[PDB]
f-box-like/wd repeat-containing protein TBL1X (Homo sapiens), 272 residues
Amino acid sequence: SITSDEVNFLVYRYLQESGFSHSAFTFGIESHISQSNINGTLVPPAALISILQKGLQYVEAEISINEDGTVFDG
Amino acid sequence: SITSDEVNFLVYRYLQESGFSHSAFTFGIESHISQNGTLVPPAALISILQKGLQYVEAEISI
Amino acid sequence: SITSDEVNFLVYRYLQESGFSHSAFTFGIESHISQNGTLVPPAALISILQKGLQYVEAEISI
Amino acid sequence: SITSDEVNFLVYRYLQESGFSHSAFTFGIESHISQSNINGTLVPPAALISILQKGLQYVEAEISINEDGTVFDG
């Protein structure tokens, strides 16, 4: 369950991968990214997008299981 | 399927809310965040990412 | 009497020319540099500052 | 005769004094201001504006001395 460093690294990498050059620079400094303890070479591309995707899907599935209810509800 | 604009708005709000003043300012421009917010509550990037890890841990428990 | 806009344009051009990419970008917005350039040649902040020190050294030689 | 560090410090202080918060931040990092060797407490307010002023005046005076020429020119 997710730390500030982890979300900061995910965001930093999103800005980099999307060519948000000015934001990447400012954010790397403001979030103190160099002092974080994450091995970037082990972080796959589109990691933020992908986890966030799966978050949306996860909520959709949490909803759809209770979507119909049962014919015995009362 | 999450769009670019949607991700961008989610991180913009995260930057604002986390007090990353200079990043929010710069990202707001670079994003062209047209400079419904109302439907994006606080901590929304974080909340969705948290659901995503829950989902990843479900694939890892296959 | 140098105006704000004039100083701002002089530093904006200095930031651009010196390769301070992120500062120029951010300053261009913060300055509202309306986003005649043609009349402001390269190294113009520097050249005027250099004349100013020449003038300061003339007051120091009073 | 003026170094990059000096003009960078002058500019940094201009952005600060004018409340250009976002630019000051970015520029302090990009110009590596912390590694410069200038004692800020000895730098007066509006220093950039003032030296730049005096530069304009200095050029005006360089011009005005040759403005009329003489009645013996030929």
